[PDB]
Curated annotation (Swiss-Prot):
Protein's gene: CA2
Main location: cytoplasm
Residues at the site labelled Involved in the binding of some activators, including histamine and L-histidine: Q90
Effect caused by changing A63S: 2-fold decrease in enzyme efficiency, as determined by kcat/KM ratio, and efficiently inhibited by chlorzolamide
PROSITE patterns per record: ALPHA_CA_1, ALPHA_CA_2
Native source organism of the sequence: Homo sapiens (Human)
Outcome following mutation: K16E: In Jogjakarta
Cofactor: Zn(2+); Co(2+)
Effect upon mutating V119 to K/R: Strongly reduced CO(2) hydrase and p-nitrophenyl acetate esterase activities
Protein name as catalogued: Carbonic anhydrase 2
Ranges for domain Alpha-carbonic anhydrase: 1-257
Site (Fine-tunes the proton-transfer properties of H-64): Y5, N60, N65
Amino acid sequence: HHWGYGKHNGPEHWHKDFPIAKGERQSPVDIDTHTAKYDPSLKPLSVSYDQATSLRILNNGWAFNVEFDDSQDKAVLKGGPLDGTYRLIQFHFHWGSLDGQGSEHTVDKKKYAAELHLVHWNTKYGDFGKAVQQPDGLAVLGIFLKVGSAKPGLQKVVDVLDSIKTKGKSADFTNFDPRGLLPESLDYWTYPGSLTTPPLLECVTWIVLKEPISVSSEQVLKFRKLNFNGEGEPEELMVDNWRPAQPLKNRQIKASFK
Ligand SMILES: [Zn+2]
């Protein structure tokens, strides 16, 4: 019996094994666009994914991760509210059972169909494991997904989902370009937060882009064909694998724009 997104092991139950779930800087949160203040101190955001090297995609029973080789600086996130260099290690999504829900962060209480998380770790800490134990160990770039026109750059991911339908399955996923999942604008909100899945460590600086990316109903539908369960077990569709907005507490969300 471990955490999940069901009625008996969902987000509302996590605090029993991970007390920090009721912490002071938990994620996700609702982004109140009218309360978020433009911050002149924020430097230009730098997303350098030209040399990104994907290696594999796996269904870990919670979502599916596209993993990258982070043994060198090839795909890094810099600038903005960040100091130093954060290296891309993996990206995954959260999505709903219906188009009206799925995202973890919300904008003026609006829920998007899904949310993409590109996870990067601070190189000053040597590795991902050491980084998550630091308040500024991770930077996560969040991007909202809405249903509309298809996203060409996401199809490659959609095409391999059939091969990793159940928990534990992985497949070769080399030469995938994450630049194809980015919206036109890099305007963003930023605040100090946590991982949104157990162990919910508060080591995340959050950078959530204002502009969502459009994906086709067909693309999202394939996401919903994945399974939380392992092969040969009763089918539980992998849907609504998102954590709800958490108390903002003593935090301020800063905007990179006006
Ligand atoms: Zn996530």
